[PDB]
Design a binder for this molecule. Sequence first.
Ligand code: A1D5S
Ligand code: NAG
Ligand code: NAG
Length: 531
Amino acid sequence: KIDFLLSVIGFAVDLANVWRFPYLCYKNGGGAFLVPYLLFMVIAGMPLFYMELALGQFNREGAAGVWKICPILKGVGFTVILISLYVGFFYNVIIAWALHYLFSSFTTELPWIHCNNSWNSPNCSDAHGTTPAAEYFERGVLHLHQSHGIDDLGPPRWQLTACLVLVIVLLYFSLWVWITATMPYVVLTALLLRGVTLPGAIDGIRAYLSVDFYRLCEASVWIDAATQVCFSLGVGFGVLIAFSSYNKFTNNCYRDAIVTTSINSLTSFSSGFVVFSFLGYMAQKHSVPIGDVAKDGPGLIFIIYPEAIATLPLSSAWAVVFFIMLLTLGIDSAMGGMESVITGLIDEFQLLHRHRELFTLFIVLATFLLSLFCVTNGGIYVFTLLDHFAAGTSILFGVLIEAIGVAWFYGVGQFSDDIQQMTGQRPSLYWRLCWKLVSPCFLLFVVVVSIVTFRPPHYGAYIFPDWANALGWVIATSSMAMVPIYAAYKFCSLPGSFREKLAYAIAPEKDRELVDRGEVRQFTLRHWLKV
Ligand SMILES: Fc1ccc(C(OCCN2CCN(CCCc3ccccc3)CC2)c2ccc(F)cc2)cc1
Ligand SMILES: *[C@@H]1O[C@H](CO)[C@@H](O)[C@H](O)[C@H]1NC(C)=O
Ligand SMILES: *[C@@H]1O[C@H](CO)[C@@H](O)[C@H](O)[C@H]1NC(C)=O
């Protein structure tokens, strides 16, 4: 009842709809990003959500223990864990920035209002060049002007290192909801009501709701939309399976999938609406076009929202409340992502059941030491590289392998009966077709297009060198290469001839009685042709 609805709210809003979605909408065409996003959502965001929810609820294992249905494909369980670790590495930095801004908001005069300060260049325009908020961010919080690229980083900054330490301590002691869940909705509604009334908001709304029919012919908005759907829904991170492994057996995993995706899409739409409504007003007030008012990067919202707060009556209170909300949202997301990895590695190995605090300490210390790279002078370059290369092709490859392993090796007709065991009904033809044919081919197309059509990352005008791209590709392939290695190890470890090795490697562990009598279900084509 109310506990069910309060659980949907927690999954409906996260840091991926407030921080990344508007920045990806602005980077691509305004309104040309909403067509691939909605198409990919409808096609392969509900089937995958349903699949992971049901798999976790039925097999009662975190991330790699659910692969008793196909022992040879356990490498995706480690791939998703590596992806989660990589994501958390740069996920901590956003919380550090939010803490910095929250501490800086306790003033009678906000520091990002005018440019008379010591961190301002002559190229600053006051309501007329660079805006005071972007200059304040870059040259007072990041100190980006002292870095000459990714090959020249410098020592870490002592102001942001303290925030990172505080975030790490809080996360560890939280890992070892009535107020925390309904605060972002109130804040976003208030911001939307404010931004609707601003003089130049209609132009931004029109640019947001207009679809450009020439930006859809480029193979970048599709990849961005697919990766953003994966980021927002949590598919491909190992989080949904781990969360659902604790749910009741006779739980309706279909209604949850139907409702959570709808509410998530509505929240994403509202966030983009607010951001573009403020962008239009800024562009009108600065006498510049909408596309030439900011840079495409993870500095949006951090540049926009302070300027929106500055126009409210008592701006200090609004700023404090907004940054507290952002801090809580980021903490929740990071703690969930880290708990996924911790529980997966605890379930996998047996010695660690006597190493709980001494394992969480190791994980958080490694995360802190790896996040220390992004608090240097040139940390935004490392942030951009990580954001481009940690997920994307690797996460889509992992999702494709998971879908293939569940729908072709185990069997969609057996998955349906497993669902019908816990819930009184079984999936219809639409769900089975989407699981078996529609989703895998689209995922394969997106993966192939992403690999063949490579676009180097950039931050405004800086173009990354060759070795940066090589290191990024190594980082991306490190998690992807976990499937063939485990497959080869599993094949070589099992005893018997080739046929017996294959039979024990592809058949489920609950079918050993049938396999021992020469009754392998995967040695006939009726099993592979059945939808
Ligand atoms: F095991 C679980 C325990 C708790 C939760 C809570 O949700 C967290 C919301 N997720 C949204 C999806 N994000 C995508 C990954 C990004 C990321 C970031 C850093 C490192 C790695 C990955 C992860 C976070 C929750 C909240 C209300 C509730 F009622 C129940 C659970 C989930 C699973
Ligand atoms: C900046 O400060 C100087 C000295 O305090 C002052 O003369 C100048 O007018 C200020 N700039 C603006 C735009 O007011
Ligand atoms: C700032 O403006 C001056 C002109 O007054 C210009 O010469 C300089 O290049 C500008 N700085 C930039 C664009 O970084």
